[PDB]
Amino acid sequence: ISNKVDAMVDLLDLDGDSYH
Amino acid sequence: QESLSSWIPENIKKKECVYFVESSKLSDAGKVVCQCGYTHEQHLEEATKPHTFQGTQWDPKKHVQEMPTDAFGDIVFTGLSQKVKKYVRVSQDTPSSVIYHLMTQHWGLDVPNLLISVTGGAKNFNMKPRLKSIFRRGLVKVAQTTGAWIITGGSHTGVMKQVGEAVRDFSLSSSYKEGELITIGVATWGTVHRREGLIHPTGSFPAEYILDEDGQGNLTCLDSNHSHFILVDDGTHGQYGVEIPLRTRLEKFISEQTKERGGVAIKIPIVCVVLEGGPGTLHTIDNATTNGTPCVVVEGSGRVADVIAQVANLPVSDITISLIQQKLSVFFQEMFETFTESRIVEWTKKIQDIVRRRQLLTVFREGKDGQQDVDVAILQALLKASRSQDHFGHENWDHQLKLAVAWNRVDIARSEIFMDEWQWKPSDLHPTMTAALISNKPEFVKLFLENGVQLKEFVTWDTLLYLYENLDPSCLFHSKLQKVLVEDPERPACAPAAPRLQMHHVAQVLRELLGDFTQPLYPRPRHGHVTFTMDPIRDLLIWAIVQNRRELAGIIWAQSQDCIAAALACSKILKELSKEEEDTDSSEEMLALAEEYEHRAIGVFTECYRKDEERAQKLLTRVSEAWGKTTCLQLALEAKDMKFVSHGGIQAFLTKVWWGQLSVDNGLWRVTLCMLAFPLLLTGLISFREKRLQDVGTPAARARAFFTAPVVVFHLNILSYFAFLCLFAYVLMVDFQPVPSWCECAIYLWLFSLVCEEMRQLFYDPDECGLMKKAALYFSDFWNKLDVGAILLFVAGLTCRLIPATLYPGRVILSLDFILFCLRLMHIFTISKTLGPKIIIVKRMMKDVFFFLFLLAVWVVSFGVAKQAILIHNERRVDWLFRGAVYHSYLTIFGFPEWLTVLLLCLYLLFTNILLLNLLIAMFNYTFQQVQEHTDQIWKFQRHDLIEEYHGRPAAPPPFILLSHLQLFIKRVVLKRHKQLKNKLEKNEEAALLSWEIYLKENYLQNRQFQQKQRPEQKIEDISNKVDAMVDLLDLDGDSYHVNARHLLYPNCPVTRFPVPNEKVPWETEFLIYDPPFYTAERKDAAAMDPMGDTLEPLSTIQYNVVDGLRDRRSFHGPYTVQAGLPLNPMGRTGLRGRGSLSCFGPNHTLYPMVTRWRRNEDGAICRKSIKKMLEVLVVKLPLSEHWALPGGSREPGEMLPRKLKRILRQEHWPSFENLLKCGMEVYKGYMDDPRNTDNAWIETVAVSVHFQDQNDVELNRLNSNLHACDSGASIRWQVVDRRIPLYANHKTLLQKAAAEFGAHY
Amino acid sequence: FTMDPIRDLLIWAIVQNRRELAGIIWAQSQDCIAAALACSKILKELSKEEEDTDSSEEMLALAEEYEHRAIGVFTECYRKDEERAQKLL
Ligand SMILES: Nc1ncnc2c1ncn2[C@@H]1O[C@H](COP(=O)(O)OP(=O)(O)OC[C@H]2O[C@@H](O)[C@H](O)[C@@H]2O)[C@@H](O)[C@H]1O
């Protein structure tokens, strides 16, 4: 269950100039 | 058996190359090979003759011939196994009816229930371990339950070896289980290593084949685990692939043509499955999927599996030939460079034509989080395919669900099979209920119950007999039933040896398990529609409880009749069984289930007692007609239901019946006070309940009821016993005298009356049990055993007193008699509040008091004979030495000689004064502490039987029990328990009582499951389900061508055509590798049809897109282009140059008429679909078409082209009248897709539709009477119209196009 | 190559009290019933002479777990077929 809710909180946290 | 060996050379053929057509490419050491080179310098098993024409490139149709087969028979592998295996060499073309008749009759294989055909890579196959795990459990587990037929290629290499090993070890590990997972292998006869030993011209009923994995060049050898073998021959030698069309053709005929049980047909379901493959695999899948068998592919497996699984959900037009070789060369990275462009276009065409038909395919997806089973995939691959294959099929609805039982998939069967569109009656679930029960599946029987099956209608008599015929043979009850049924002696005459199983047999073992007191449950017949017993549910509960099926019996008890007797009966049966279990795990669960049922009975009883006391009092004494005419309380006493009897209300009932007629509350001393005085009871000094006696004083009846109470009888009996023993002691003491005094005869007759009462205790039982069992039970009584021991000692002492010379011994013998009476006074303090437990304690402690007494005895006699031997000389004094030695030993045991005296006395204080007392300390601390708790319940349990006795005992004292004794003896000479313990109640009263308790049962159950929900593990499970639903919710946040034309396998003409993808179809796109064979039919050079099948000559001069006389060689769509004097398909490329079996080039014009009418109900109104209505068409079925199709003809004649379809079908003269009536409505005209299309000779149609609106008498009457149908055809009939109805798919396009003109359904 | 490598590998794992390792590699044993017995006997003969207040306890408990493993496999194979499993001892 702790792994489930950690995956859940990870998923809810988921929501140049060119010279020489 | 010789019918087979005669039958095979009659029936089956085998191929033979007859002529030497010597191959240009000489084989590897087979340089003498005539393009097959089987067994000669030539390809010949006869004279390689000129045969009047040495035809170069000898045609396999023309060279190779059929011959009768002799190579059949049986086989065994040399030392690798011990069993025998059947095998047949078979022709290339064989009717599958022949092979099915062979495998059924002359091999003895019954019809299956499932056909798994597994295919994979043979010589070059590699697999990860995870893939290996599914073969060991997933394939074997789904094969072994349903009784499948694993059919595969017969080879020792690759995947077929994996199936062969994984089915073998199951048969060894089954431990002599019945049945074997039957396996049939099919391989080509050409590529067999040592087949020259197999050909025996006579019937090779024994044979020996030794496999050798050395000499495998081109060929390969057989596997040794397959149980039947089929060897298709082709006449060729090294070819790979002559087994695929025969296997595919055979699988369909087995699946859908053999089972027709109550109806039209019912198809045995069938699944092809793949693991990893190559060019043999794609041809197998492509040939299979055209025949309607679904195919599941497995992800993460191998080469071909991954490249099919990647292109699963893609649109059909999105396949590029670049993308094919791109995805190909990465997975085929070993042999990626070995690919040519023709192989790429062939594989692109095959993958295209496979992923077109999205119904008939499924991916396993390799979900890999549970990696559940193949079963969850195979079930959905059944269900999607079954709906698409047919919509009117009912076999799948009932045949499929049963299969869904056996793999425990309730979510699937609820969601998919029980959505809608079945219209089942509930009793139709009866057989698929039964197998859900025998296979011990609680979830499906719960779902059938929630769907509406009635148990009370379900359990017939024969159903119950069949239920007991299939017990789990691992259990103890099956072994006991077999030990009875084998020892059943009264079955002399039958066809077999093992006679039958009758219900009185299981009744007989149940009576011996349950106890003697009940009657037999099932009667033996002394010899319809449905034989129904008194109650089905009791016997169902018995069947569930003997096999330790926990959650099942927990379910079905909720529908009981009288649950209180039921849970008692099951707890008693479980306790009587679990002692004899002899297994270290079955006994424990068997005990715990009985304890749970005790709890159930207690919980329902404390409810119904709390509802109403005095009514629930009647419940215990009630005889149950169900359980063999007994009441519950004696059954509970039999079961030692220790927690149950200890309830307060039942003990209050016992106290109420114990205190007799009067009120209960009088204490003990006031009872003795009114016992002492006669006329006090007539006064106002005592209590009475039943206030009619308390108010209205009838002192005769009041004293009668007072003496009727068993407390009074107990007290007068113990008082008479006390006076008897005191007078016996006084007369024994001083009145001993040789002549008989009056007092000795007085105590003798007192004892005589006492033993007549004790004999009456032996001779009462109206429950006609074993009289041997009755005497054993009374002899099992401890106090009765002491009583009869005292009787035997008394009658010994009386005849010793009779001898006048033995007066001193006999008298003191009677002295021991007095001791044997006073121990009976220990019988009192059972009725005490507290002391009875201590009586139980000393009754426990006597058991090791005895075997400690033995060891102390042998120790003290050893010390005594030592003490006798040490301090005396040897003398023969018999009465002088032994008596003084015994006196010295008793003086020891009642608790220069200095060194020896100190040694003797220190040994005496050493071993005697220390050790054995400590042994008793340990032993009696153990036998105390093992029982020092539950004994109060044991006393409460033991309270009953004395009350039982004294209610049974008459009220007279033993000085006056003879008045009752004579009356009872003359009553039983000239000609029954009390009603207060057992009574047949009134039936209507009993029905009210049963309805009352059965109402209270559900009130118990709700709060029971409610509090059972409040255990914390349940809330943990609920929270995990909540968060899994949460993570699921947060995870939630083509080009239309002539595809029936490009399809391979030109009908009725064994040729091929070129692989054409979706890119290179039209004439605009250039296809540089396009080289179709200039293919003509055999009848392409023939009668009135155009002879331009060989139009390379200048004979091709007929009119193009114009009417060349009667041949209207002009398209309805538009002008076709001409190249090299031949027309091209305006639709695109097909892959075959030429005319084919068509009449002429360009379009071949034909008319397809259709008849339509409405489908009426029983009333005559239009039957209704969900929105639209029902339509009927009249279709034909030819005897060698195996298909329904439209009666449409070629438009080579003008108006009789429907008669060219239907001169023989419709009529002769009335046909021209209906042709005059055939002026109807046109739906579609033009080019039609068809498998008989080359690039030159395609099909154009006109489609007319005529209709019947009225379904009475009008135009239809002319269609009825005119009919002259039975000419040269098999069948014609009207038919319902739906999207799943059988037909040619080309004609199904016409119906789906013309159904819009009338608004029918789809 | 010896008669069996896996027995000696199990010996190496079990003398150093490597718990989860030997728990893994026992799954590929040859005849596990003799094996778990041998390891429990070796653990009991070692843990008495351990002279450490923590190594002896875990050394004993692992042997008890291996006793349980041997019991659990034996009660399976006896329940499959009695008289054949009689020959095993
Ligand atoms: N019937 C056969 N038996 C043994 N080996 C074979 C066979 N057919 C082909 N092979 C060898 O297998 C090699 C290629 O094997 P794959 O491509 O992995 O397998 P594939 O050729 O796709 O064969 C599929 C095979 O499954 C069977 O159901 C069917 O008989 C078909 O031959 C080739 O070199 C070929 O010599």
Ligand SMILES: Nc1ncnc2c1ncn2[C@@H]1O[C@H](COP(=O)(O)OP(=O)(O)OC[C@H]2O[C@@H](O)[C@H](O)[C@@H]2O)[C@@H](O)[C@H]1O
């Ligand atoms: N559109 C189509 N869809 C499916 N099959 C077709 C189609 N057109 C032709 N066929 C099949 O091609 C085969 C050869 O075509 P014809 O013989 O020209 O068709 P037809 O004359 O309508 O059928 C003659 C019938 O007489 C029997 O001897 C024979 O079994 C065949 O069913 C037939 O078996 C027919 O089933």
